[PDB]
Amino acid sequence: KILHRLLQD
Amino acid sequence: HKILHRLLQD
Amino acid sequence: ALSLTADQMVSALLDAEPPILYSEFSEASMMGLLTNLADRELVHMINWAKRVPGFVDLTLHDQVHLLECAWLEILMIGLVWRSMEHPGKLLFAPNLLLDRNQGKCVMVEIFDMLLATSSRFRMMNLQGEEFVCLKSIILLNSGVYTFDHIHRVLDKITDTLIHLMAKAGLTLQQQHQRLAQLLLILSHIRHMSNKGMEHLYSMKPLSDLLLEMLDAH
Amino acid sequence: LTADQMVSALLDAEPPILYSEASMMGLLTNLADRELVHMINWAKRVPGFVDLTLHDQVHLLECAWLEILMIGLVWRSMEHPGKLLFAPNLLLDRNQGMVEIFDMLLATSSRFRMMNLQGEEFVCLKSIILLNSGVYTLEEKDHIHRVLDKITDTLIHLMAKAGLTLQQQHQRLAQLLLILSHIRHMSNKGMEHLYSMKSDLLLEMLDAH
Numbered sequence A: 001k002i003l004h005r006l007l008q009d
Numbered sequence B: 001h002k003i004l005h006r007l008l009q010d
Numbered sequence C: 001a002l003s004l005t006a007d008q009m010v011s012a013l014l015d016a017e018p019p020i021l022y023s024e025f026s027e028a029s030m031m032g033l034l035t036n037l038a039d040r041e042l043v044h045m046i047n048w049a050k051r052v053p054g055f056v057d058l059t060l061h062d063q064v065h066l067l068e069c070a071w072l073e074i075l076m077i078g079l080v081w082r083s084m085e086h087p088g089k090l091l092f093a094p095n096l097l098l099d100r101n102q103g104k105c106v107m108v109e110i111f112d113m114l115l116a117t118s119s120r121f122r123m124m125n126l127q128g129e130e131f132v133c134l135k136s137i138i139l140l141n142s143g144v145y146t147f148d149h150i151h152r153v154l155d156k157i158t159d160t161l162i163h164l165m166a167k168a169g170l171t172l173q174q175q176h177q178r179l180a181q182l183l184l185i186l187s188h189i190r191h192m193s194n195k196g197m198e199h200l201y202s203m204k205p206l207s208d209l210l211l212e213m214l215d216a217h
Numbered sequence D: 001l002t003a004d005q006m007v008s009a010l011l012d013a014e015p016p017i018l019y020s021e022a023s024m025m026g027l028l029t030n031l032a033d034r035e036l037v038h039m040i041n042w043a044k045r046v047p048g049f050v051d052l053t054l055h056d057q058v059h060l061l062e063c064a065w066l067e068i069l070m071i072g073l074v075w076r077s078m079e080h081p082g083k084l085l086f087a088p089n090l091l092l093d094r095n096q097g098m099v100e101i102f103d104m105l106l107a108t109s110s111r112f113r114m115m116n117l118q119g120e121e122f123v124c125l126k127s128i129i130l131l132n133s134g135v136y137t138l139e140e141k142d143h144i145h146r147v148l149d150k151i152t153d154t155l156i157h158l159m160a161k162a163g164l165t166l167q168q169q170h171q172r173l174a175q176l177l178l179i180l181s182h183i184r185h186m187s188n189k190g191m192e193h194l195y196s197m198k199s200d201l202l203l204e205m206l207d208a209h
């Protein structure tokens, strides 16, 4: 959820 | 007590 | 124990090995067979533990603590070992062999982790001499940080593991690399045990011995 | 990367030591939640991690985040016997304890102190935890195992440069990795209490277990 957002950039 | 304390010395 | 050579250490461990027991389905019967099997295995595990070099040197209080903390781990690594030559399936007993699909009776998360470990042992081509070493390490290590002699015996088994690897023609790099790979698997075995134990206390007719193991956790 | 380059990469990638502001659990959760943000950015700088797929990177972090938080805690608490240094302004003793977890962390900290754990070894163990905790749950696994083997060589490389015989090297390596089993144990038990008494990011972390 959240995690694939922060690590993507 | 505990069962285990018998098996371990016998 | 610390006086034993590496060849003698292995011979003691190989000779102390418990036999592969047999067993006598739904979610009620299936847990019944495994419980009956595990309870009979535990009696042999206790006698195996006594024969583990350096184990009887510990206080009777400590012997109980180590076994109480490591019993499911030891049961699992044994299971994983026997299931090695049976890909995609778990060999609980020669007469009790289950597939992943037959794991969803009660437990399917535990099955895939064990299968993963078994295929991991096979991909590493884990030798029996290495197996009995890992098992003894699990016994002496799992409860040592929840209480000096033990760390020396652990060091002895480390020397023993390397000796096997060195005698099998692996370079000094592959020796410590393989050593590392084997011990990191013990992290997963610990994980599976923790996940298994919370599940066992969820459902719990267990025996006296198998119940007393659970409250320890 | 060389062994020297592996260490330099990890050491420079180290997250900062953050500060803190039912009573205790509020602080720890707030602290862990802010640490998680730094852990993620630290994870990217761990050699070989970003080479993995985005799907795999999260599985590894979701499974190992508390282990990584705990070994960090254990590490900074090394030179403070009988106490846990959650933050430079938050040093807690055993009495202020869930205390079963505290005793295990103290035991691990005292174990690190007996072993004279070096920082260079710590960043290796921490990175090992990240790559190992979720790997047993095909060409990508070959890679992770290749990085792990690289970190193994790095650990051995460090020990040899400290004047340790090849026996002591092989013994110390085992000793370090056996501790990762206890760290896994502490994490699962910690995770077990965390899910019992229940920010945004930490929710995805807790629900993963």
Ligand SMILES: CC[C@@H](c1ccc(O)cc1)C(c1ccc(O)cc1)c1ccc(O)cc1
Residues within 6 Å of the ligand: C031, C034, C035, C037, C038, C041, C075, C076, C078, C079, C092, C107, C110, C114, C196, C197, C199, C200, C210
């Ligand atoms: C992997 C199955 C494992 C298990 C554990 C916990 C679960 O929730 C489900 C399954 C099982 C077992 C492992 C190894 C072995 O040699 C014999 C049996 C088992 C042990 C104890 C017990 O009271 C019941 C079942």
Ligand SMILES: CC[C@@H](c1ccc(O)cc1)C(c1ccc(O)cc1)c1ccc(O)cc1
Residues within 6 Å of the ligand: D025, D028, D029, D031, D032, D035, D069, D070, D072, D073, D086, D098, D101, D105, D189, D190, D191, D193, D194, D202
């Ligand atoms: C050891 C305390 C640890 C903890 C974990 C689980 C428990 O049940 C009790 C305590 C704690 C923490 C560990 C390391 C770190 O850097 C910051 C904080 C913590 C993590 C997450 C969380 O939602 C709340 C508290």
